[PDB]
PDB file of C-alpha atoms in Angstrom:
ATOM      1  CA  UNK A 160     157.710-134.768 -85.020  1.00  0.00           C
ATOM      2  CA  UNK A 161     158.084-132.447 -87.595  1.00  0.00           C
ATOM      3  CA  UNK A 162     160.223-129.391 -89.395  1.00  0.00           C
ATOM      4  CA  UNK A 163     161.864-127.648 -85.953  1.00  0.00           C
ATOM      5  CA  UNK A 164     159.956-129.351 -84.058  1.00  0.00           C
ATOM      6  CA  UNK A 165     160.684-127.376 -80.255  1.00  0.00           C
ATOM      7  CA  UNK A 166     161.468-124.456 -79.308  1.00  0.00           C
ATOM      8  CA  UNK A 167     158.013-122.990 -81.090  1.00  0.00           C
ATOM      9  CA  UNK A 168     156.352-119.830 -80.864  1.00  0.00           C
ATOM     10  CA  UNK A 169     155.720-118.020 -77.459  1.00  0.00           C
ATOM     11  CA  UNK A 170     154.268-114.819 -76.209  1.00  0.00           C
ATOM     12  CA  UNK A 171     154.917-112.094 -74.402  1.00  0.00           C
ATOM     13  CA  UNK A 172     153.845-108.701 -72.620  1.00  0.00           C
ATOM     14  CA  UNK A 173     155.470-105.888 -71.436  1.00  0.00           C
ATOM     15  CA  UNK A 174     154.825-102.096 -70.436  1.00  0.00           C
ATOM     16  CA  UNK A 175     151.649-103.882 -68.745  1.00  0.00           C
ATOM     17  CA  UNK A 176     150.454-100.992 -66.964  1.00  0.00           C
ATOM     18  CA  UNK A 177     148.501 -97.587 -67.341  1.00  0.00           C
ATOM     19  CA  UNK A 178     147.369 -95.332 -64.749  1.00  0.00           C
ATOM     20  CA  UNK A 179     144.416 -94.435 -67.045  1.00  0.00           C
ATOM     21  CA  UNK A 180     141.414 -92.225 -66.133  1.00  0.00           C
ATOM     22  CA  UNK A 181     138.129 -92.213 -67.948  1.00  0.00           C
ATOM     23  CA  UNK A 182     136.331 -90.177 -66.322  1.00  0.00           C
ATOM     24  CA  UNK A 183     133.290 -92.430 -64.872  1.00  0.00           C
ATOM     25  CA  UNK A 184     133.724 -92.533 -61.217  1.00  0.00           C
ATOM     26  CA  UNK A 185     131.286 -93.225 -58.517  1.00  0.00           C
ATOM     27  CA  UNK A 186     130.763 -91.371 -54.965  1.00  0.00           C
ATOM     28  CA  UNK A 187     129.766 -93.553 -51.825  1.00  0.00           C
ATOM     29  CA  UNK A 188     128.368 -92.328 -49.136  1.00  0.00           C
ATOM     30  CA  UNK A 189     129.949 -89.392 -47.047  1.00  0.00           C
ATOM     31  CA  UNK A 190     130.112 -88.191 -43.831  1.00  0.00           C
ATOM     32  CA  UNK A 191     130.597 -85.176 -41.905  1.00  0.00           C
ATOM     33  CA  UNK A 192     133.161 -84.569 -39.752  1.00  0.00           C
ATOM     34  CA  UNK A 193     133.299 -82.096 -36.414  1.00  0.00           C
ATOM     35  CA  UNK A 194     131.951 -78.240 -36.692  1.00  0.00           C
ATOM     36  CA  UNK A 195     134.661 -76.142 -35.993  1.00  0.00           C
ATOM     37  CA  UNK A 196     134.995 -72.262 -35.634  1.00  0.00           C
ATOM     38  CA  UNK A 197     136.617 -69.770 -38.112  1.00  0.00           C
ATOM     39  CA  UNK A 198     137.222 -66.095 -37.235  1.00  0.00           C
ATOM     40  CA  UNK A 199     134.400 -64.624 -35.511  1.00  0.00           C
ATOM     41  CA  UNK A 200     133.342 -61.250 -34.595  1.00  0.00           C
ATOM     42  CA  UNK A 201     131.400 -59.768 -31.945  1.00  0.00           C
ATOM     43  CA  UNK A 202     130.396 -56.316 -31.590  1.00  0.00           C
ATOM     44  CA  UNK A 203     128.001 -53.559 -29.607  1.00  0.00           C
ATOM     45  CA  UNK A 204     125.578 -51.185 -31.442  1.00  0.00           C
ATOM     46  CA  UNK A 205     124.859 -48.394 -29.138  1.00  0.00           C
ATOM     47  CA  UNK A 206     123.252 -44.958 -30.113  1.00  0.00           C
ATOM     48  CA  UNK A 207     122.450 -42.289 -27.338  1.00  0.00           C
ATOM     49  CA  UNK A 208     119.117 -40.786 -24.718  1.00  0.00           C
ATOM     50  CA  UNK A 209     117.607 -39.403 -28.441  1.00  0.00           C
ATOM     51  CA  UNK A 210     118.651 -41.062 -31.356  1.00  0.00           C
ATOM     52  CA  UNK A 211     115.511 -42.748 -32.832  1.00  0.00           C
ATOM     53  CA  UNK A 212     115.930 -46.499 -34.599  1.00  0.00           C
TER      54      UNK A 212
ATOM     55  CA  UNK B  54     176.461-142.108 -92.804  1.00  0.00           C
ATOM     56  CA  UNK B  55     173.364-141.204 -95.285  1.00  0.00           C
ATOM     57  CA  UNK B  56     172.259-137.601 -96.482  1.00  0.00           C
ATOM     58  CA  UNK B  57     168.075-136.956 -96.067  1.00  0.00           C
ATOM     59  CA  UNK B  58     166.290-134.910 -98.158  1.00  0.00           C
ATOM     60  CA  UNK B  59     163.220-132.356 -97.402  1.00  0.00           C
ATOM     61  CA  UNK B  60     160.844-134.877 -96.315  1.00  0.00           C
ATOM     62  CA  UNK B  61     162.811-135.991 -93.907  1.00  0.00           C
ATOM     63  CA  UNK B  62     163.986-132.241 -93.054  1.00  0.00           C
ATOM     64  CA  UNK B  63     167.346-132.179 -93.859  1.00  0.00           C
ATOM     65  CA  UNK B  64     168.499-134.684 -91.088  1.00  0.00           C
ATOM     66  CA  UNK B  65     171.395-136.499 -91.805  1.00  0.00           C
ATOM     67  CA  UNK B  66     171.899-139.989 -90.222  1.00  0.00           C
ATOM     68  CA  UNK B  67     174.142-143.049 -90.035  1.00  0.00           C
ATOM     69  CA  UNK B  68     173.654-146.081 -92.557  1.00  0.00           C
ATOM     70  CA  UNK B  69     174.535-147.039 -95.927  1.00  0.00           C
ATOM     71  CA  UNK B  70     172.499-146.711 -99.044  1.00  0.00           C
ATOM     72  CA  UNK B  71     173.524-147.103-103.008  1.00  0.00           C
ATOM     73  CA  UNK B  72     173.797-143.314-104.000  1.00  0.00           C
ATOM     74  CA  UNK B  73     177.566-142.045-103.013  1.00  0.00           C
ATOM     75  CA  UNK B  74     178.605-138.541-103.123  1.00  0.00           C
ATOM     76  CA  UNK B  75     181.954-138.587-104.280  1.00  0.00           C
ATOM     77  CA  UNK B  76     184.182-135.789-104.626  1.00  0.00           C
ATOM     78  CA  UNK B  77     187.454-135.776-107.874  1.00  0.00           C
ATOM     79  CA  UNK B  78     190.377-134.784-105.183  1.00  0.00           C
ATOM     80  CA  UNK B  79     191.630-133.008-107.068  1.00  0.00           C
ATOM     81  CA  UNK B  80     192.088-129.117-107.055  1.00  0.00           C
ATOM     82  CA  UNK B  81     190.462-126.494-109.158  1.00  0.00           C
ATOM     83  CA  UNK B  82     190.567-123.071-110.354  1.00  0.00           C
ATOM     84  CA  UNK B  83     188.400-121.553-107.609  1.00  0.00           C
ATOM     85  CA  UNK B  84     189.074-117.685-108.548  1.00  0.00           C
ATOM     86  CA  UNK B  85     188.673-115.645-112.018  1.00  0.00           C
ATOM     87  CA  UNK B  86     190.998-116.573-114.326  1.00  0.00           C
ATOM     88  CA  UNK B  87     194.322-114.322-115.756  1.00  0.00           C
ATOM     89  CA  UNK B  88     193.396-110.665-116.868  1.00  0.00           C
ATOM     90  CA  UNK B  89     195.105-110.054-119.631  1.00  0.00           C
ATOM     91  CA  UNK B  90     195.322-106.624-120.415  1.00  0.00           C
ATOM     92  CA  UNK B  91     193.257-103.609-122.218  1.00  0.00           C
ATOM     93  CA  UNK B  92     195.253-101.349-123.428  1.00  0.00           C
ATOM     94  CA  UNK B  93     193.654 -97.790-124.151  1.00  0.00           C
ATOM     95  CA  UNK B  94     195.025 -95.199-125.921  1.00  0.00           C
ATOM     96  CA  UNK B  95     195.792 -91.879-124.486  1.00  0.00           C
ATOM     97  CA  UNK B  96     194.054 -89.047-124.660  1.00  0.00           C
ATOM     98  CA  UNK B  97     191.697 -86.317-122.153  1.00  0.00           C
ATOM     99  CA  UNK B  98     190.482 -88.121-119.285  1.00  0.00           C
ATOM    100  CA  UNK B  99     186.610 -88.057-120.532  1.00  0.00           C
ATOM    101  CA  UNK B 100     187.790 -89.022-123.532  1.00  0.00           C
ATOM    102  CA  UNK B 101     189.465 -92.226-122.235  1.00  0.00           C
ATOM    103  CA  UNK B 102     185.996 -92.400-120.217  1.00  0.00           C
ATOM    104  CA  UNK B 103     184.361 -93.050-123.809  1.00  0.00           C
ATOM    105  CA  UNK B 104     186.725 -95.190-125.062  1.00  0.00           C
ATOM    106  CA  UNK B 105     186.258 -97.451-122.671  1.00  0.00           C
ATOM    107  CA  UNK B 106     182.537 -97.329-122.629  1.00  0.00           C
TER     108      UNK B 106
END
């Protein structure tokens, strides 16, 4: 009953979504993955029969 | 059929009551009636801007 009674008030969303970041994060715990080599050098130091250290 | 007022909100339904609307058939003079005429004397168009004013 009533004055328009139906077809009442509804509501509704849009542009529901947002990629925000505030800053607050949190870090679990890590782990460490395999060693592996880099470039590497290897070398001789030689000096003579009389040349003091 | 029977005309309902505001209370009622402005539904109109069948059945008889005791207060007709009735309506003269007859036509009438539904537009501005016969203008006349104004007649201005001449003279510099401002001028005949004052006149009339």
């Amino acid at each position: 009953d009533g004055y328009r009674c139906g077809d009442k008030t509804a509501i509704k969303v849009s542009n529901f979504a947002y990629n925000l970041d505030p800053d607050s994060f949190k870090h679990g715990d890590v782990t460490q993955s395999d060693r592996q080599l880099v470039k590497t050098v290897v070398g001789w130091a030689v000096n003579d029969s009389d040349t003091p250290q | 059929w029977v005309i309902m007022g505001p209370g009622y909100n402005g539904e109109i339904k069948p059945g008889t009551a005791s207060n007709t609307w009735c309506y003269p058939t007859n036509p009438v003079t539904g537009e501005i009636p016969t203008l006349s005429a104004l007649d201005i004397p001449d003279g510099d168009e401002v001028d005949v801007q004052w006149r009339l004013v």
